[PDB]
Structure formats: C-alpha cells, structure tokens
Design a protein around this ligand. Structure first.
Ligand SMILES: N#CC[C@H](C1CCCC1)n1cc(-c2nc(Nc3ccc(C4CCNCC4)cc3)nc3[nH]ccc23)cn1
Length: 289
C-alpha cells in the first residue's frame, strides 16, 4: 500500500536483533502533510529472516487490540526486495526508556495500569494461540501516559494445532534472563513460558529500570560473576532449579512480589493464566484507589 518513494526517513527509533525501526514521514503529496509512521526493516535480509519477517507481518496484521501496536501496511521495492513493515508511530517510545526517564512521576497505581494492559494484550495473543517469546519492557511501547502496547513480534510463533508448546532454538543471542527454565533446558515455549517472562516484566517495572537491578545484573551477581559464556546458561539453569529468584524490588509490596513468584514457578502447569493475572492486578488497583 505504501510506496517507498514517499517514505521520508527521519531518524532511527530502535534496534533489535537483525532488525530495526525508523521514524519516517509518509508524505505522498510531498507537501509535509503526511503522517509520521514507524517502519521496521531487516538488517540482514536472508531467506530465513525474510520468511520469518513475512510470518511476523501476517501475525501483526491479524491482531486488533487496544494494547497491540497497529499494523498499517507493507512497503517493498524492486519486485519484492527490502520488505518493510509500516506501523503506527507511538510518540513516547519504549516503556523501558520511558519508565527510566519519568521514574519520579510514575507511581505504583500507574505501573499496575500498564501491567493490566500488558496482561490483556497477552491474553488476546493466547486466544490466537500465539506465543510471544520476547516479553520485556524493551518490547512494550507507550502511546500516551495512560496506554501501553505490545510493540514487537519478531520472535512470536503460532502453536501447532495439536500441541501446547513450540520447540525452537535458532542461532544468535537469546534473552536468557527472561526465559522460563524449560525454555533454557528444552527450548520449549508456551503460554506458560510467556507467563514466566511476564513475571520478569513485572519485576522490571517495579525496579523502575534502575540499572544495577536489571535481571541480567541480579542473575549474574547470584550465579557468580566470573562465569564463562555457555557456563552462564548452565549455572542459570542450576540456579533456577534450586529456586533462586530475582529479589523483591525496592518499595514493591508483598502481594505484587507474590504475583512475580507465582509466575516464576518451576512447574509449568502451576503458573497463573493471563486472565487471572489481570483479575488480581485489577483488584489490587481497585484496593489502592
Ligand atoms: N517495541 C519494541 C522494540 C523495537 C526494536 C526495533 C526492532 C525490534 C526491536 N522498537 C520498536 C520501536 C517503535 N518506536 C516507536 N516510537 C518511538 C521510539 C523511540 C522514541 C524516542 C523517544 C524520545 N527520545 C527520542 C526517541 C520515540 C518514539 N513507535 C513504534 N511503532 C512501532 C514500533 C515502534 C522502537 N524500538
């Protein structure tokens, strides 16, 4: 739908792994009236990254929800090379950076508003049988002070029709400090591993992204910080099997930490559902108000 000749590059907004998002102005009339959009592209347009990207685009296009970034279209050149995904531009950027920047202005009730919106977005994913696999505040975007959206689906997979998990280990770096144990040991991803990662997201939020308190920093201090490469993963696994966990963040109430710890259950089937997480968060919100 979008012609590349009319996409005006403005700046880079974010970089992932093998991909990036740019702020552009779509201005077909060439009079500086076009709307600003976010444009995702591959940084290395190989076959498997390209088919993965096409599947990611199809996934995003099939999602329509208040807390999921809006698909707008695609843009390609030259036959079909340099495929680009056009999305709505959300003016406050990632929740990670936004929270770190406005920590003094954002109270617990607002954190729980965001938490509730993330849970509702994730529940919608689950109704489509999609596994996000990369839930983290760096992949949540801020539309305004009252609304966040899941903002990236580059690792999202669809469950087999006959199974409740998806096994995949692809080369590169993996956000292992957000991974459920069964994802570390067996590469198994499920709604329940998304729930584990959501618990880490809740931890992130209540740390206010204070950067000695990041999951990587805390876990590395727990496993020993002389650890080596692959050994890290091994030690992390051992840590989680002995019920080592991220600590309660400064100022975090006990009941919120308990939501976290319930999401961090070694037993995959004992983790709460996203609907129950939303109910509990919303009840605490109501109590606070
Ligand atoms: N998620 C997610 C992560 C993803 C990575 C890129 C590819 C995979 C991982 N990534 C998506 C966006 C993104 N950013 C915006 N806006 C935005 C962003 C930054 C600012 C800063 C605010 C103030 N300081 C100066 C600039 C302002 C606005 N809008 C978007 N729409 C769709 C995506 C998207 C950014 N990183």
């Amino acid at each position: 739908q979008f012609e590349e000749r009319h996409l005006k590059f403005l700046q880079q907004l974010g970089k992932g792994n093998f991909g990036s998002v740019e702020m552009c102005r779509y201005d077909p009339l060439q009079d500086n009236t076009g709307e600003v959009v976010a444009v995702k592209k591959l940084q290395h347009s190989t076959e498997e990254h390209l088919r993965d990207f096409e599947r990611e685009i199809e996934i995003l296009k099939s999602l329509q929800h208040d807390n999921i970034v809006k698909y707008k279209g695609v843009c390609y050149s030259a036959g079909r090379r340099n495929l680009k995904l056009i999305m709505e531009y959300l003016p406050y950027g990632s929740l990670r950076d936004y929270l770190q920047k406005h920590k003094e202005r954002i109270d617990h009730i607002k954190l729980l508003q965001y938490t509730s919106q993330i849970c509702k977005g994730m529940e919608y994913l689950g109704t489509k049988r999609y596994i996000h696999r990369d839930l983290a505040t760096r992949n949540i975007l801020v539309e305004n002070e009252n609304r966040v959206k899941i903002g990236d689906f580059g690792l999202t997979k669809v469950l087999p029709q006959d199974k409740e998990y998806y096994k995949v280990k692809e080369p590169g770096e993996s956000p292992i400090f957000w991974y459920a144990p069964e994802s570390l040991t067996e590469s198994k991803f499920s709604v329940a591993s998304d729930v584990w990662s959501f618990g880490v997201v809740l931890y992130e939020l209540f740390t206010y992204i204070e950067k000695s308190k990041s999951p990587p920093a805390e876990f590395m201090r727990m496993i020993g910080n002389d650890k080596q490469g692959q050994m890290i993963v091994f030690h992390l696994i051992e840590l989680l099997k002995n019920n080592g966990r991220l600590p309660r963040p400064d100022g975090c109430p006990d009941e919120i930490y308990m939501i976290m710890t319930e999401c961090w259950n070694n037993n995959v089937n004992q983790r709460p559902s996203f609907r129950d997480l939303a109910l509990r968060v919303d009840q605490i919100r109501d109590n606070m108000a």
